[PDB]
Amino acid sequence: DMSSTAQRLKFLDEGVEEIDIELARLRFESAVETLLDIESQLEDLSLMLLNLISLKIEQRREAISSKLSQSILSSNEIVHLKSGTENMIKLGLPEQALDLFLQNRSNFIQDLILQIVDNPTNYLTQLAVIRFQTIKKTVEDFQDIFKELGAKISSILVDWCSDEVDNHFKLIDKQLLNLSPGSIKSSRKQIDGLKAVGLDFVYKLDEFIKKNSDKIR
């Protein structure tokens, strides 16, 4: 025969399978929204059938992450990166979303830098723009997306920011293997402007200068 809960349960089983069609046609929002409903719902009813549907949810839950991750990792325009990052968040994976999202910004940076040493200062300057321009923008987008996310997630942001700055200097270190005072004002400025999105990394510039004094003249 048929009971009341077994009724509800069978629909949850329908719901689960729908998530495959939704992920199919690229509706990541719908995917997450249904998934969380089938789980907030699945929480109240808590058996054979339950544990059985519960397992199908983990399955799809996983599947959604894989997609979002892969998706985030390859967005061109912000709009893609934007939502993907959010849905990855709504799913309840804010750190993994931030973590992946920043890697995307990182790669954007690698790839652009490859796409160019013609002449010493034309290199160093173009290099700074690229870097600090994506560091600033990534902080401004991190603001309109990871808002109210917490102190930790927000410290992580800053860490990647620290390393990116570091990278740039590691890129000059190679270059100092065969600097100029017309490169300093450029970089400095490029670094002071970071303060506009709350970042003070003037110190890294200064330190790097202290140890390469002999090679700046």
Curated annotation (Swiss-Prot):
- In this entry, which stretches build a coiled coil? 7-54
Q: Tell where it localizes.
A: Cytoplasmic vesicle, Secretory vesicle; Bud; Bud neck
Q: Which domain of life is it from?
A: Eukaryota
Binding partners and assembly = Component of the exocyst complex composed of SEC3, SEC5, SEC6, SEC8, SEC10, SEC15, EXO70 and EXO84. Also interacts with SNP1.
What family is reported?
Belongs to the EXO84 family.
Q: What does this protein do?
A: Involved in the secretory pathway as part of the exocyst complex which tethers secretory vesicles to the sites of exocytosis. Plays a role in both the assembly of the exocyst and the polarization of this complex to specific sites of the plasma membrane for exocytosis and to the budding site. Also involved in assembly of the spliceosome.
Q: Give the protein name, as stated in the record.
A: Exocyst complex component EXO84
The organism of origin for this protein: Saccharomyces cerevisiae (strain ATCC 204508 / S288c)
User: What range of the full-length protein does this chain span?
Assistant: 525 to 753 of 753
